[PDB]
From a paper:
In eukaryotes, the core Sec61 channel forms a larger translocon associating with the multimeric translocon-associated protein (TRAP) complex and oligosaccharyltransferase (OST) complexes. In the Sec61/OST/TRAP translocon, the TRAP complex aids ribosome docking to the Sec61 translocon and participates in protein folding, while the OST complex mediates N-linked glycosylation. Phylogenetic analyses indicate the inheritance of eukaryotic Sec61/oligosaccharyltransferase/translocon-associated protein translocon subunits from an Asgard archaea ancestor. Asgard archaea are predicted to have a complete Sec61αβγ complex and many of the components of the OST and TRAP complexes.
To probe the global structural similarities between the MK-D1 and eukaryotic Sec61/OST/TRAP translocons, we constructed the AF2 predicted models of MK-D1 Sec61, OST and TRAP complexes and superimposed them onto the eukaryotic Sec61/OST/TRAP translocon cryo-electron microscopy (cryoEM) structure. We were particularly intrigued by the cytoplasmic C-terminal domain of OST1, which forms a cytoplasmic helical bundle in the MK-D1 model and in the eukaryotic structure (circled). To confirm the validity of the AF2 model in this region, we expressed, purified, crystallized, and solved the X-ray structure of this domain. Finally, to ascertain whether this cytoplasmic domain of MK-D1 OST1 can interact with ribosomes, we produced histidine-tagged domains from MK-D1 and human OST1 and carried out pulldowns on nickel-nitrilotriacetic acid (NTA) beads against HeLa cell lysate, and semi-purified and highly purified human ribosomes. Ribosomes were detected to bind to the human and MK-D1 cytoplasmic C-terminal domains of OST1, but not to the negative control, the MK-D1 OST1 extracellular N-terminal domains. The C-terminal domains of OST1 were able to recruit ribosomes from samples with different levels of ribosome purity, indicating a direct and specific interaction. This finding suggests that MK-D1 OST1 participates in the recruitment of MK-D1 ribosomes to the Sec61/OST/TRAP translocon at the cell membrane for translation and translocation of membrane proteins and preproteins. A comparison of the surface residues of the human and MK-D1 cytoplasmic C-terminal domains of OST1 reveals surface patches of basic residues that cluster in regions that may be able to interact with the RNA components of the ribosome. Here, we show that the cytoplasmic C-terminal domain of archaea OST1 also mediates interactions with the ribosome, and specifically, the MK-D1 OST1 complex can engage human ribosomes, despite the ∼1.8 BY of divergence of the two species. Furthermore, we show that the cytoplasmic domain of Candidatus Prometheoarchaeum syntrophicum strain MK-D1 oligosaccharyltransferase 1 (ribophorin I) can interact with eukaryotic ribosomes.
Author numbering: 466 to 607
Amino acid sequence: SVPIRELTRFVTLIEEKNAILLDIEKADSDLRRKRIQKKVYTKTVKNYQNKLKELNEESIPFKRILMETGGQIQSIIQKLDFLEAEKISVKDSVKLLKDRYKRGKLPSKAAYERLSSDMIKQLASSQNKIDRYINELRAYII
């Protein structure tokens, strides 16, 4: 069926996780714009990464109960896992593309601009689907 108790807890947990992940991006942005000392960066990120590890541990029992129902809830959670990983990959891809471009190792400015635009769209597309699937879980409760 649908375990309302576990789902109600899980929805709050994954919103908090999505929020911390976006705070990590904010730290990443502050770093490359040199608006934060790398002292405060590696400190704050290691602190955020501990909140994540602890939230991910706490979510384990609820997530297992939810995935063992199969069907649509299981499917949504699996996509959320995928989309989170995909957004991380795109993040590292843009950073690499930027280093490869400033070192003059790309064919052309037009190629760089098209690929980087592609990656920014993919970042928004991934985050869009994450928010949508979080809202689909929430709709079970609210």
